[model samples]
Target chain A: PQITLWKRPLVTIKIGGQLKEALLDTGADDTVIEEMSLPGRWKPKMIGGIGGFIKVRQYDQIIIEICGHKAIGTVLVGPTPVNIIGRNLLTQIGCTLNF
Target chain B: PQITLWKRPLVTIKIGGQLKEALLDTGADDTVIEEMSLPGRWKPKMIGGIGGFIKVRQYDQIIIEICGHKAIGTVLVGPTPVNIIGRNLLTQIGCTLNF
Candidate 1:
């Protein structure tokens, strides 16, 4: 299979009213949340296989109602220093990256 | 080797004068620039032995100085679309991901 390695854009994201700086990674399969930044009322679980056992997984899945679109998925669940959104959530979005 | 799979955050980035939405990927090793959104005076070239032969590589290299911190790296280019900032750029900054 062929893959398209596009350039990543540096942008800021808002979490419950806070702004964060982040990079866009298409290589990852799911969005990542920091242990400290995990949303409210969320849990953390481990998923085996693929990228090995990931202990930093999040439990708070949210429905991203972007403008007129929405998707239901899990965000990183823990008190981590930062947050990340990977292919797991991006595959469902239609927006493109900009540098 | 130990690897950390973090969540990606959705954020907006500025290029020249345009604002773009992007994801934060921790798995990636470098920040990416879309071919269409590449900065001024940059030329896209290829570096062998990594990620295969990518025709969508960018020709521009920019110095990202965040909050007084700085780093120099190449951005991805091509007419394909999408820009990304990988682990390559994130490591320089002490920022973390959010869901």
Candidate 2:
């Protein structure tokens, strides 16, 4: 499926047996999700954003279903205002930006 | 051109007769560039992100050359960590996310 950039490019995704919307962020280096429980072990990590930096819990090898396609990668749980699906997982699902 | 998610999708863009690299950010609502000079009247605005909100100067109908394609739209100048080419300008360039 192809998603045009006319909108925010938010898509329904499944994680931890729950469905939620996440933005497909080509600019972000890591996939960061708003405070959500991801079953597994996580490590403390800090990441930078537009205004400043924030601390987050990094979970590896997490499964996420995006638009019916499954991808697995590192996901960060933090106090982000929104959930972001970054290139870490996008690559596994063969997501591409085309013009 | 099609950009895979294997790497950060940063491309060179021309704005105000100057060239700079910008990330193709599908998650961002509007195009936001780092502190720069532009010739125009703008209104002060505030926008939010993963970390927090920041004040910005908004310039409408700014001409930006992206990847050999031309796009005109509102561009925000602020204290962002990096220049972000958001959906506002990306839609004009026909950028799409595909999986």
Candidate 3:
């Protein structure tokens, strides 16, 4: 018998004052943002990735509240490859996989 | 008649554990990085920019020490069109333009 490895799904986030919603995933170690989604003057640093490197920035700690839970940590600023809500965030939100 | 507006030059930033030196400028509101430059497991958010949208993240205030001074502020992470050390950083580092 072959067993399957289940993965967590992406969570959605609605940024303050923005009419757009984004997806977040726990498998993702970083809390990524879309480059085109930013308003202006919100600076970032480019920390290179699998698809080569770009200029991006790193945030200290942010409060993420979801599903009656909250998580705080630094966020990486850039475009989305995949939106992840990571383990730290997951625990903060008091959730886990049922596999 | 034409006038001259000499802008400040870009400063250089050598990230920890990387040999490449990135340029920093005051006009550059963001502190960008190359995607491929990250070691691993580092994630970001996709804040919109002139180049459309990509997934990236945001980091809170960071302590950046350069030229015997330090600047603590939020960093926006993404790829660089141009590098910058903003007024906040410039002021913290006690630097200003001579023109």
Per-residue lDDT for A2-67 in model 3, tens only?
111221123345443333343433223345555433333445565443234556555555665543
Candidate 3 docking class: incorrect
> Could you give candidate 2's per-residue lDDT for residues B47-96 as a string of tens digits?
99877999999999899999989989999999999999988999998889
Q: Each predicted model: what fraction of the native A–B Cα contacts (within 8 Å) does it retain?
A: 0.06, 0.94, 0.00
The A-chain TM-scores of all the candidates are 0.55, 0.96, 0.55
**Each candidate: what lDDT?**
0.47, 0.91, 0.43
TM-score of each: 0.38, 0.97, 0.35
| Model 1: per-residue Cα lDDT over A1-99, one tens digit each | 112233334446555555555444444565665544444575556632121345554555565542223556776653332344556665555443323
Better of 1 and 2 by TM-score: 2
- The predicted structure with the larger lDDT, 2 or 3, is 2
lDDT of 2 at A8: 80
For model 2, name the residue pairs that clash.
Answer: none
Positional deviation of A38 in candidate 1, in angstroms?
A: 32
Superposed model 2: Cα runs more than 4 Å off: none
Lowest summed lDDT window (length 10), candidate 3 chain B? B1-10
Error of 1 at A41 (Å): 34
